[PDB]
Every structure is written in C-alpha cells, then in structure tokens.
Enzyme design. Structure first.
Site, mmCIF file in Angstrom:
data_model
loop_
_atom_site.group_PDB
_atom_site.id
_atom_site.type_symbol
_atom_site.label_atom_id
_atom_site.label_comp_id
_atom_site.label_asym_id
_atom_site.label_seq_id
_atom_site.Cartn_x
_atom_site.Cartn_y
_atom_site.Cartn_z
ATOM 1 N N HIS A 40 -40.479 -12.544 -37.826
ATOM 2 C CA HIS A 40 -40.240 -13.049 -39.170
ATOM 3 C C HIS A 40 -41.232 -14.149 -39.558
ATOM 4 O O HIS A 40 -41.285 -14.482 -40.770
ATOM 5 C CB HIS A 40 -38.791 -13.483 -39.382
ATOM 6 C CG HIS A 40 -38.476 -14.873 -38.913
ATOM 7 N ND1 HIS A 40 -37.867 -15.165 -37.696
ATOM 8 C CD2 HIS A 40 -38.600 -16.037 -39.569
ATOM 9 C CE1 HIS A 40 -37.685 -16.502 -37.642
ATOM 10 N NE2 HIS A 40 -38.089 -17.059 -38.802
ATOM 11 N N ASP A 84 -36.803 -9.626 -33.121
ATOM 12 C CA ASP A 84 -37.585 -10.655 -33.810
ATOM 13 C C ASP A 84 -38.626 -11.257 -32.861
ATOM 14 O O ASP A 84 -38.488 -12.376 -32.343
ATOM 15 C CB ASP A 84 -36.663 -11.698 -34.415
ATOM 16 C CG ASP A 84 -37.380 -12.661 -35.345
ATOM 17 O OD1 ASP A 84 -38.483 -12.329 -35.712
ATOM 18 O OD2 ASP A 84 -36.781 -13.700 -35.720
ATOM 19 N N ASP A 171 -29.842 -28.961 -32.925
ATOM 20 C CA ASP A 171 -30.214 -27.578 -33.140
ATOM 21 C C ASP A 171 -31.709 -27.496 -33.449
ATOM 22 O O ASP A 171 -32.347 -28.509 -33.735
ATOM 23 C CB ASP A 171 -29.390 -27.020 -34.294
ATOM 24 C CG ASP A 171 -29.360 -25.502 -34.457
ATOM 25 O OD1 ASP A 171 -29.874 -24.779 -33.574
ATOM 26 O OD2 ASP A 171 -28.742 -25.023 -35.422
ATOM 27 N N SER A 172 -32.284 -26.287 -33.379
ATOM 28 C CA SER A 172 -33.576 -26.036 -34.012
ATOM 29 C C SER A 172 -33.333 -25.747 -35.495
ATOM 30 O O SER A 172 -32.189 -25.694 -35.942
ATOM 31 C CB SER A 172 -34.309 -24.925 -33.293
ATOM 32 O OG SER A 172 -33.535 -23.745 -33.283
ATOM 33 N N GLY A 175 -38.968 -24.002 -39.700
ATOM 34 C CA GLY A 175 -40.224 -24.583 -39.239
ATOM 35 C C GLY A 175 -40.403 -24.555 -37.721
ATOM 36 O O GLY A 175 -41.530 -24.647 -37.213
ATOM 37 N N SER A 177 -39.160 -21.942 -36.123
ATOM 38 C CA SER A 177 -39.167 -20.491 -35.946
ATOM 39 C C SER A 177 -40.382 -20.030 -35.182
ATOM 40 O O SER A 177 -41.470 -20.518 -35.449
ATOM 41 C CB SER A 177 -39.178 -19.801 -37.254
ATOM 42 O OG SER A 177 -37.934 -20.020 -37.921
ATOM 43 N N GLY A 178 -40.174 -19.109 -34.275
ATOM 44 C CA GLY A 178 -41.241 -18.582 -33.461
ATOM 45 C C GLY A 178 -41.530 -19.375 -32.186
ATOM 46 O O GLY A 178 -42.223 -18.849 -31.284
#
Ligand SMILES: [Ca+2]
Length: 223
Positions: A40, A84, A171-172, A175, A177-178
């Site tokens: 994503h 993902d 949490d994450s 930004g 992401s990945g």
C-alpha cells in the site's frame, strides 16, 4: 509512532525512508540491493534513503539511491490489505557499514508475547497531528491471534498479526507504514494498518513476513 522514544542516530541501521519528494513510508534493507515495504506504499518515483536519522537534515551518513523496480506481491488486495508486501530493487548496491546494515529474514514465525521493535517517522499523536524529524522507536508485544480476531472481526487473515497494547496509548501510525517489526533479530512484520492509532482495543495490524520468505527469495534470485 505514538508513545515511543527517540531511537538514537543509526541504532536501527536497516530502517529506510521512502521519498517521493517527501517522506511517505518506511522500509527495511534485507541485502545490499533490496528493500521490503508494504504494497500500500506503492508509488512511482521512489528514492530510497538509508543511514537516516533526521529526515530533514543531511547529517553525513546517508545514502540516497533511486529504485530501479518495484514489485507488489502478486496476490495483494488493496481492499482487505491481504498480502500487503512489496519489494524494491535499488539501482545500485548500498555500502554496508555500522550505520547501514541489512536485517535477517525469519526462518520460523514469531511467537505470541514476544517483544518486538517497531520504528518509523510516522505521526506521534493518537489524534491531532505531529510528525517527527528524527527516527522513533516502540517496543510492543505480539498479541494472540484470538485477541487480534476479536479486535477486528471478519478482517484478519492468516497473513496478518496484531502487536501492541489493548489499553491504547502506544502504536505505530500513518507514515510508519511499510517499516519494520523486528523480533529476536529477524524481520517478522511490516507496518500495515489499524483503526486510528493507539486507540483502546484497536492494536496495530502487521504483514506476517514469515509467510513470504519463499516468494522473497525466488524474486530476488530472478531480478
Ligand atoms: Ca538526514
């Protein structure tokens, strides 16, 4: 990262920033020529930035290398975020040193209750918005599949796992992401999705890397 801490410059040497004129996603360096991220996070025109701490200051240890190819998993479903995961090949090999280093792929999947390290330059507020300039870190445990499925009924596949805190606060976030989830020295997760960030009973959902090692090895061996 919400409720985390400042990592320390180049203490997470496998963490990369993906840049398309601005930082937009994280990733992990798995050898001198390849990065793993989330599907994503796909966009055209990616530059990979390695050796980063402050993404807004050139501090001297960075390597900036353009992507030559992106490969989204063949079964990626953008509606459900199943599968993902994406590989990114660098146009030239990175120079591996104490500041820029690869992370191992898993041989075995990680266990519930394992404390993992999650890192990124994503939003630091639960709601409201504030993006850091330096890399942030979070320790978080892997949750049981039954708790994961209870938090997100009808939404969790065998290629996902939850990590974090059911009380919320840590949490994450967007930004991040990945980016990596590293447990016992191995890349076990990719920051994928969640409902909000750091909300009660809504933990982070991560791509389960150990289900993809065969695809990663075959793809790297052919590209
Ligand atoms: Ca920098």
């Amino acid at each position: 990262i919400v409720g985390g801490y400042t990592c320390g410059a180049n203490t997470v040497p496998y963490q990369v920033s993906l840049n398309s004129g601005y930082h937009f996603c994280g990733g992990s360096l798995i050898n001198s020529q390849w990065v793993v991220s989330a599907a994503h996070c796909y966009k055209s025109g990616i530059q990979v930035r390695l050796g980063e701490d402050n993404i807004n200051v050139v501090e001297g240890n960075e390597q900036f290398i353009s992507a030559s190819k992106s490969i989204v998993h063949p079964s990626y479903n953008s509606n459900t975020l199943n599968n993902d995961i994406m590989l990114i090949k660098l146009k030239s090999a990175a120079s591996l040193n104490s500041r820029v280093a690869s992370i191992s792929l898993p041989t075995s999947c990680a266990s519930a209750g394992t404390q993992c390290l999650i890192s990124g330059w994503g939003n630091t507020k639960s709601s409201g918005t504030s993006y850091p300039d330096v890399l942030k870190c979070l320790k978080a445990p892997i949750l049981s599949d039954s708790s994961c499925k209870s938090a997100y009924p009808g939404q969790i596949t065998s290629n996902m796992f939850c990590a974090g805190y059911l009380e919320g606060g840590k949490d994450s976030c967007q930004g991040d992401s990945g980016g990596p989830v590293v447990c016992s020295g191995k890349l076990q997760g990719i920051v994928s999705w969640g409902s909000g960030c750091a909300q009660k009973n809504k933990p982070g959902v991560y791509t389960k890397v150990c289900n993809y090692v065969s695809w990663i090895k075959q793809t790297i061996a052919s590209n």
